[PDB]
């Protein structure tokens, strides 16, 4: 079936699953769980495809301006800092 609405801390497998779609896990090897989205001025991860982040994407209406760099970067690590606009 599809899984929906998992809370902060529940184990997850993509961000759709999480009420704040950010299924995070620092380190590649860790057990990925729902995390809160980034506050303004904290670190972020740019929006990804692989639905599991190392750092959460930013909460509403902040931009996480860091370096959406080339492949490599974008095939894994683009981080940044949530800034308003």
């Amino acid at each position: 079936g599809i899984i929906i609405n998992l809370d902060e801390g529940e184990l997850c497998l993509n961000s759709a699953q999480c009420k704040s779609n950010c299924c995070q896990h620092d380190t590649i090897l860790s057990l990925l769980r729902c995390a809160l989205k980034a506050r303004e001025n904290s670190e972020c991860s740019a929006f990804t495809l692989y639905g599991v982040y190392y750092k959460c994407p930013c909460e509403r209406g902040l931009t996480c301006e860091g370096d959406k760099s080339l492949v490599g970067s974008i095939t894994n690590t683009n981080f940044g800092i949530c800034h308003n606009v």
């Binding site: 809160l36 506050r39 303004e40 001025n41 509403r60 209406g61 308003n84």
Partner: protein, 449 residues
């Protein structure tokens, strides 16, 4: 019968001690060499390797124990697996903020037994502490007013005994989650109660009933201040134990059964964090956690909120009554602290359905986005919310407003916020105004008016 022991005196068997319904079985206290109260001393000068002192001058005399700084004793009770270190860690943080004689009290020998034995043996660790406390006083003239006894589970009631025997001259006892079985509703003699020191402050955390629910902590108010974090019964972070109308307390206690000790261990984890966060746990006088969560006790009264834990001695009305309850919310881990804010929002813009969220920014940092209301966003209507900011922001400088809904919005409507008022828990109100409105999911900065 009665039983007497070298130094500690005699320990009766009468009601209330034994016989009464809560503690029916007549057990008497194992003897002092069997209980084996060790006093392990830690100080600023020996922070991390203890030195064993004892109630006589040839022990105290060469040691780091110092009569010009306070002494505070940490008495354990339930020690979970892994949790062996907890008494030391409370010492390590005292040293981060003060010069102190931090005596941890060990009595594993008396505590590793049936619960009822231990409930009884608590009496020896009680007279043990009172003996050391009276000692420093005759030996060295060291007032009990400098003494602070911190005890967790049974230990709480050990400190309660210690204080009882010093006839409440001890400066403060702190119960961190006074065990329930054999003590709740049992008379004051048998348990921790406001008269065991000049000031007694307790942190209830696992106050559920022990049977059917394994609510190891007492729920009854026993201090002049009783803080009930997260409503004194389930703590965020803590797995709950499954029901049983027949609970094996000895089994829970020796560790034959299973036990999510988390809710009970949390009072010393809150106390430890409290030492290094001195505004971070403010207790609001509510009359129940439900009234409290229904945003009705906020801010602190005229003369503060009391800090739960370590800094509660500073609350100026701490002994004006017994049993004063205070509620508060904490984190679910790590730094346990939280700062509570009430923000009201007045709407400007269109009538729409959505979530309004606000976020604070102050001299020392900014919160994240806390939802203030959901549903019909009607212009010129006000909304309020109290929330627990994991960040103290300092004095507010600006605020930001934002709204959204999960429906495509054809009009491309625009809501904003006329004024947004932030009331700190001390109660300062800060005002923010905007003539702007903004589109769904754009951050409308407000600024002071």
């Amino acid at each position: 019968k009665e039983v007497c022991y070298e130094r500690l005196g005699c320990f009766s068997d009468d009601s209330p001690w034994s016989g009464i319904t809560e503690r029916p079985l007549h057990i008497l206290p194992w003897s002092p060499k069997d209980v084996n109260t060790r006093f392990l001393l830690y100080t600023n000068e020996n922070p991390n390797n203890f030195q064993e002192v004892a109630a006589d001058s040839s022990s105290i005399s060469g040691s780091n124990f110092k009569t010009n700084r306070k002494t505070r004793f940490i008495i354990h009770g339930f020690i979970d697996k892994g949790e062996e270190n907890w008494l030391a860690n409370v010492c390590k943080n005292l040293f981060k903020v003060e010069s102190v004689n931090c005596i941890c009290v060990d009595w594993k020998g008396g505590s590793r037994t049936g619960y009822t034995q231990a409930s009884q043996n608590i009496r020896i660790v009680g007279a043990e502490v009172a003996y050391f406390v009276e000692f420093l006083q005759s030996a060295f003239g060291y007032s009990p007013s400098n003494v602070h006894v911190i005890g967790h589970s049974l230990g709480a009631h050990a400190a309660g005994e210690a204080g009882r025997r010093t006839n409440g001259t001890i400066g403060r006892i702190t119960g961190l989650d006074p065990a329930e079985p054999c003590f709740q509703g049992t008379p004051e003699l048998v348990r921790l109660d406001p008269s065991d020191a000049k000031f007694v402050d307790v942190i209830h955390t696992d106050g559920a009933p022990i049977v059917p629910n394994l609510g190891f902590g007492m729920s009854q108010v026993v201090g002049h201040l009783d803080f009930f974090p997260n409503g004194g019964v389930e703590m965020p972070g803590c797995k709950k134990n499954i029901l049983s109308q027949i609970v094996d307390i000895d089994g829970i206690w020796e560790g034959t059964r299973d036990f999510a000790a988390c809710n009970h261990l949390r009072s010393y984890k809150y106390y430890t964090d409290s030492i290094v966060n001195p505004d971070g746990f403010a207790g609001f006088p509510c009359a129940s956690y439900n009234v409290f969560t229904a945003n009705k006790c906020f801010p602190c009264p005229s003369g503060g909120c009391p800090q739960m834990g370590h800094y509660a001695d500073r609350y100026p009305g701490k002994t004006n009554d017994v049993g004063q309850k205070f509620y508060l919310d904490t984190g679910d881990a790590s730094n346990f602290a939280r700062w509570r804010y009430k923000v009201s929002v007045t709407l400007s813009g269109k009538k729409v359905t959505g979530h309004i969220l606000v976020s604070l920014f102050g001299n020392k940092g900014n919160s994240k986005q806390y939802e203030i209301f959901k549903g019909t966003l009607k212009p010129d209507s006000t909304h309020s919310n109290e929330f627990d900011s994991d960040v103290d922001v300092g004095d507010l400088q600006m605020v930001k407003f934002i709204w959204y809904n999960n429906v495509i919005n054809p009009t491309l409507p625009r809501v904003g916020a006329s004024k947004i008022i932030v009331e700190t828990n001390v109660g300062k109100q800060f005002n923010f105004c905007s003539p702007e409105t903004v589109r769904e999911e754009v951050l409308l900065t407000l600024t002071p008016c």
